[PDB]
Nucleic acid binder design. Structure first.
Ligand SMILES: [Cl-]
Ligand SMILES: [Mg+2]
Length: 540
DNA sequence: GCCACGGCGC
DNA sequence: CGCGCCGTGGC
């Protein structure tokens, strides 16, 4: 019947809002409305109307809370049916999609969004009845985490603009060097960024052997996997690979970052999304912190650009081998649990079991083999891939994988048990009961079935790691406020804080303690911590 | 501007 | 070895 009533709404109303753009830190609030009992109240002047609300309840509540924080309003996010939908099925990642699946329509009008939010919340809440683990995640993780994320996004991080100018110049000079040499080898200029023009140069003009097709166009692929095979076939190949590496880094993590510095705050406001991934891991965007290269000289150079405010320090905390520890816990493998209890270098210790030698006798290459499998086993890394990674024969790679499962037989069992669970129930679950649906486990084509199988036993591990971190963020947040410290970034199994230099050390001790004790496992949780004026220094 | 796409990073 | 990111090329 569409009851309209004057602004302001009664307490408990769901909010609907329209932004000029999707990024709340950069957007104008174009419209605000609230709904309760289906009765809609539309705000005459949105910004003024914000201070009437006591919390943001509704779709994308966190995003409205971010914009409110920018304006200096304390408007914490509360109930949001996105969070409910994501717990019901993590393929539910957007309002549009949630509405299309469960009822109603995501439109561009505030009042309609508010009414929809209220409807969907009631709907999805009923759908969750009796799902006590998922409801626990909602109350103890998702809802309170949304408030942490709002604060992190609104706070942002300071960038070293002088450093970024210098890094940009350095990389530009090396890129120019490389493309000069490519054009020399090629005999003319062409657009290096064009895979079409590159294909013609490599395979038509230079006559190099093609290998793989492109996914859809059917052309001769110029991908890294193809070039890798040809590194010796022609010196231009190596140069192109270096060019692509640097250009990706510059175009993604050097050129965009200064443009992302907000004119009002002077800081970068990375956006955090808690309903975006299949596993329950948080995601970041503008920039995506997850895709900054790891363990290359280049990745390091990017993190150096992230700095503390003057008189402050960054505190970086990292859960050491958390996914393997989780695998130990879920599988119950006594030998792997022993690896973590006899706690020296974990990969050396894994190698000593694998190869049946004392830890003293493990050489660095043996350790690398163990390290590589400790991560590959989590997603069913093939012998073929391991063979490329370690540069060993295929048969030897096979033997290494078998050694691993021979020493850790309950890991082998756990993988198979998890697949049985997925095939029986149609879903798999984390330690805390976060759930992922895995329909293709019973597929016709083996190609898709194997991808489904990897997804199936990988998610419980990644998802458990994800929720340990999120639970730690929730526990840690209010205690940081006590100290005048703040939470800035989260990526992988790492958390970055900012604190006054006088309190950095105490903040580090406190954060370490809370993270390591967030939940008891069969093995200890270990947190590496460092302090520095920049993120790279603080990783040290 | 829109899009699908190859390519690359985790 | 799903998803966010880049620039390209068609519209
Ligand atoms: Cl937008
Ligand atoms: Mg051009």
């Amino acid at each position: 019947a569409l009851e309209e009533a004057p602004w302001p709404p009664p307490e408990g109303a769901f909010v609907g809002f329209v932004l000029s753009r999707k990024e709340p830190m950069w957007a104008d609030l174009l419209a605000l409305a609230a709904a309760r009992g289906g009765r809609v109240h539309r705000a005459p002047e949105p910004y003024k109307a914000l201070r009437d609300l006591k919390e943001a309840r509704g779709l994308l509540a966190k995003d409205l809370s971010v914009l409110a924080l920018r304006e200096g309003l304390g408007l914490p996010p509360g109930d949001d049916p996105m969070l409910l939908a994501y717990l019901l099925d993590p393929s539910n990642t957007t309002p549009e999609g949630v509405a299309r699946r469960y009822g109603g329509e995501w439109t561009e009008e505030a009042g309609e969004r508010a009414a929809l939010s209220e409807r969907l919340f009631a709907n999805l809440w009923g759908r969750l009845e009796g799902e006590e683990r998922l409801l626990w995640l909602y109350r103890e993780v998702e809802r309170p985490l949304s408030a942490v994320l709002a604060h992190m996004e609104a706070t942002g991080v300071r960038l070293d603009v002088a450093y970024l100018r210098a890094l940009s110049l350095e990389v530009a000079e090396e890129i120019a060097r490389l493309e000069a040499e490519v054009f020399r080898l090629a005999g003319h200029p062409f657009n290096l960024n064009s895979r079409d023009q590159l294909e013609r140069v490599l395979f038509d003009e230079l006559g190099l052997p093609a290998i793989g097709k492109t996914e859809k166009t059917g052309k001769r692929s110029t991908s890294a996997a193809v070039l890798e095979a040809l590194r010796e076939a022609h010196p231009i190949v190596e140069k192109i690979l270096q060019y692509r590496e640097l250009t990706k880094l510059k175009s993604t993590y050097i050129d965009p970052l200064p443009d992302l510095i907000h004119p009002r705050t002077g800081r970068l406001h990375t956006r955090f999304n808690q309903t975006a991934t299949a596993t329950g891991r948080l995601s970041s965007s503008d920039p995506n912190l997850q895709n900054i290269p790891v363990r290359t000289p280049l990745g390091q150079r990017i993190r150096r650009a992230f700095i503390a405010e003057e008189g402050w320090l960054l505190v970086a905390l990292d859960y050491s081998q958390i996914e393997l520890r989780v695998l130990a816990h879920l599988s119950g493998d006594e030998n792997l649990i022993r690896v973590f209890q006899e706690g020296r270098d974990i990969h050396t210790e894994t190698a000593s079991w694998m190869f049946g030698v004392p830890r003293e006798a493990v050489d660095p290459l043996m350790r690398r083999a163990a390290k590589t499998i400790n991560f590959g086993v989590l997603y069913g890394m093939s012998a073929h891939r391991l063979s490329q990674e370690l540069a060993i024969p295929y048969e030897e790679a096979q033997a290494f994988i078998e050694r691993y499962f021979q020493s850790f037989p309950k890991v082998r069992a756990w993988i198979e048990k998890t697949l049985e669970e997925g095939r029986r129930r149609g879903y798999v679950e984390t330690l805390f009961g976060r759930r992922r649906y895995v329909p293709d486990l019973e597929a016709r084509v083996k190609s898709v079935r194997e991808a489904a199988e990897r997804m199936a036993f990988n998610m419980p591990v990644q998802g458990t790691a994800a929720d340990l971190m999120k639970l730690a963020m929730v526990k840690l947040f209010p205690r940081l406020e006590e100290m005048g410290a703040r939470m800035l970034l989260q990526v992988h199994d790492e958390l970055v804080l900012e604190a006054p230099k006088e309190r950095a050390e105490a903040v580090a001790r406190l954060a370490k303690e809370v993270m390591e004790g967030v939940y008891p496992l069969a093995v200890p949780l270990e947190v590496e911590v460092g302090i520095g004026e920049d993120w790279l220094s603080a990783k040290e």
